[PDB]
Structure 1
Amino acid sequence: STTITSGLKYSLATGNWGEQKKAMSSRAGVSQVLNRYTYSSTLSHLRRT
């Protein structure tokens, strides 16, 4: 059960979308820390491409 759990948690925590041992060549920045400076900034961050 640790495989899927650790993989999902790592990819969501660091933003590298892939396996942990293939961090290079993986698409980075997919997951980001939510911007909570003000309400409008959070709303803008949740609708970003």
Structure 2
Amino acid sequence: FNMKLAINAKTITSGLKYALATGNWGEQKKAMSSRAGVSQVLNRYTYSS
């Protein structure tokens, strides 16, 4: 029972990276209904913005 073969790191790593990036808060590249726009690019027009 080789440990490195057992636990797939990419599962949680890219699983969070997907949500945060795209914004479809759910698993994963097969998302719907998933809630899009949960994560979005921070407005940097003005400081108040």
Q: TM-score, normalised by structure 1?
A: 0.77
Q: How many residues align?
A: 41
Tell me the distance in 2 between the aligned counterparts of 1:3 and 1:31. 19
More helix by share: 1
Give the aligned CA root-mean-square deviation in angstroms: 0.9
Of 8, 27, 30, which residue of structure 2 is paired with 1:19? 27
Structure showing greater radius of gyration is 2
Q: TM-score, normalised by structure 2?
A: 0.77
Identity, in percent, stands at 93
Q: CA deviation at 1:22?
A: 3.5
More strand by share: 1
Unpaired stretches in structure 1, ≥5 consecutive residues: 42-49
4+ runs of 1 displaced by more than 2 Å? Answer: none
